[PDB]
Design a protein around this ligand. Structure first.
Ligand SMILES: [Cl-]
Ligand SMILES: [Cl-]
Length: 227
């Protein structure tokens, strides 16, 4: 079907983010590939402006849910692939409990044969000595569920979830995520019933890379519709 046929193989990915958090500006480029048949992503991100002024884990969710594995019985409800190749706009607010928030606007679409995620991120109201700008968050990542609902009015979807970032003192920082996705163009989309994505993410470093960077391996599987 439309869009999902573009994901049967391994697809190259490009990620590009312009960020400004509390006035601290940065840019990040990423490259890698996705194999939606297995829900599999492999990505490497490089901060092209120097040192990243926020913890890498805080950007994971912002840096391509069209690569989720939708089981065959759920494929009528895979919005993200259905919008391709024209794509979708993905907007989020990420509210760090007792700290500031990120607002992200992204366009996810094909440019030629490459799946691109172009993002602008703005962060406001952060504590300069908080867990984010104080770099108190551990370089690790928990497994989470992403809860998806249809947005009939906008012909798209919403999602809600709460990321839990381990802090170096053995506590956890909550990062509430509010998400809205809108298809690009007048084409057909598959609006889903309520369901979720089960997401596991592993963060590492490239031993040969001297720039500030993050390697991400992620598995995402849709679930919650069966009966
Ligand atoms: Cl970090
Ligand atoms: Cl969760």
């Amino acid at each position: 079907s439309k869009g999902e046929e573009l994901f049967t193989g391994v697809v190259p990915i490009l990620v590009e983010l312009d960020g400004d958090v509390n006035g601290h500006k940065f840019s990040v480029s990423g490259e890698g590939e996705g194999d939606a048949t297995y829900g599999k992503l492999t990505l490497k991100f490089i901060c092209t402006t120097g040192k990243l002024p926020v913890p890498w884990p805080t950007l994971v969710t912002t840096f391509v849910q069209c690569f989720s594995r939708y089981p065959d019985h759920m494929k009528r409800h895979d919005f993200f692939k259905s919008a391709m190749p024209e794509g979708y706009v993905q907007e989020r607010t990420i509210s760090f409990k007792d700290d500031g928030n990120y607002k992200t606007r992204a366009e996810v679409k094909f440019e030629g044969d490459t799946l691109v995620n172009r993002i602008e991120l703005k962060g406001i109201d952060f504590k300069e000595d908080g867990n984010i700008l104080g770099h108190k968050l551990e370089y690790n990542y928990n497994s989470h569920n992403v809860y998806i609902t249809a947005d009939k009015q906008k012909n798209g979807i919403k999602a809600n979830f709460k990321i839990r970032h381990n802090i170096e003192d053995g506590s956890v920082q909550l990062a509430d995520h509010y998400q809205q996705n809108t298809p690009i163009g007048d084409g057909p989309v598959l609006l889903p019933d309520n369901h979720y994505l089960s997401v596991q993410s592993a963060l590492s470093k490239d031993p040969n890379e001297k720039r500030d960077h993050m390697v991400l391996l992620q598995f995402v599987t849709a679930a919650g519709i069966t009966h």
